[PDB]
A paper describes a structure:
CYTOKININ RESPONSE1 (CRE1), the main cytokinin receptor, has a modular architecture composed of a cytokinin-binding CHASE (Cyclases/Histidine kinases Associated Sensory Extracellular) domain, followed by a transmembrane fragment, an intracellular histidine kinase (HK) domain, and a receiver domain (REC). Perception of cytokinin signaling involves (i) a hormone molecule binding to the CHASE domain, (ii) CRE1 autophosphorylation at a conserved His residue in the HK domain, followed by a phosphorelay to (iii) a conserved Asp residue in the REC domain, (iv) a histidine-containing phosphotransfer protein (HPt), and (v) a response regulator (RR). This work focuses on the crystal structures of the REC domain of CRE1 from the model plant Arabidopsis thaliana and from the model legume Medicago truncatula.
The structure of AtCRE1-REC was determined in two isomorphous variants of space group P21212 with two protein subunits (chains A and B) in the asymmetric unit forming a homodimer. The structure of the AtCRE1-REC-Mg2+ complex (referred to as AtCRE1-REC-Mg), determined at 1.7 Å resolution, encompasses residues Leu918-Ser1057, extended at the N-terminus by a Ser-Asn-Ala cloning artifact. In the final model, subunit A is comprised of 139 residues and subunit B of 127 residues. In chains A and B, there are two, and 15 missing residues (Ser1056-Ser1057/Ser1043-Ser1057), respectively, which could not be modeled in the electron density because of disorder. There are 182 water molecules, one ethylene glycol and one (4S)-2-methyl-2,4-pentadiol (MPD) molecule in the asymmetric unit. For protein structure analysis, the full C-terminal construct from the Mg2+ complex above is used. In the AtCRE1-REC-Mg complex, the octahedral coordination sphere consists of six oxygen atoms: two Oδ of Asp929 and Asp973, one backbone O atom of Gln975 and three water molecules. As a result, the Mg2+ ion lies farther away from Asp1013 and a water molecule fills up the coordination sphere, bridging it with the Oδ atom of Asp1013 (helix α4).
Residue numbers in the entry:
A (entry chain B): 916 to 1042
B (entry chain A): 917 to 1055
């Protein structure tokens, strides 16, 4: 697959600037993008059945972080599978750039000169 | 070898990390001293010391790597104030633990992966400076 034409993608992030950046990146490849400012708003949009092909999930959000949002999505999918035999599995990718940048920023602020980086630390994972 | 003649302090509360870091550095010829905590590291870094660099775990109980680094820098700043001598220990964060833990919780919570290095739109970093008034301009 070269393009995201015909795909509809949910971007979940409490920071509107991140939502704009992520949306612009995905639309460049043809995606239709819907934004959600919280995990709560996202769970509402993902009530099964829904029309989303993938979701990018911020980690640090107040009230409900991205891990709790994801657990709730997987619980919904598990209930539907058990009640209907239909197996939904929304692709969910974390947006980890924020947490990594914040870690390096605190290293710098504390007075460190740099960091040791192992090959895995800055790679993306699409599993 | 690459680090022959260098002495390096490894600060990490996990013995396995200390083993791996010291083993790597010795492969390059370095002398390695390990410390299990910030408080131990600060005792070892009383000025003057003989260390050429320090690898600093960020997450440790009682004193984390940021606090330990701030106190090292305070030691160095006081030395400059009192003696005029310049001390600036290279300190590199060991971040693999915190980043591992984040990626692991992504997968444990049920995510299919993560994006730390995103695609960046052509226009993300581009912009034009514009002036309200006409203005000549040169290098
Ligand atoms: Mg956030
Ligand atoms: Mg630690």
């Amino acid at each position: 697959n070269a393009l995201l034409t015909g795909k509809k993608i949910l971007v979940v992030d409490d920071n509107i600037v991140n939502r704009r950046v992520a949306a612009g990146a995905l639309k460049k490849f043809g995606a239709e993008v819907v934004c959600a400012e919280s995990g709560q708003v996202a769970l509402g949009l993902l009530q099964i059945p829904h029309t989303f092909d993938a979701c990018f999930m911020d980690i640090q959000m107040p009230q409900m972080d991205g891990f709790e949002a994801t657990r709730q999505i997987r619980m919904m999918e598990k209930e539907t599978k058990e009640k209907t035999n239909l197996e939904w599995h929304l692709p969910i990718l974390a947006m980890t750039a924020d947490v990594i940048h914040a870690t390096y920023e605190e290293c710098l602020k504390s007075g460190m000169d740099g960091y040791v980086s192992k090959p895995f630390e800055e790679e993306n994972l699409y599993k």
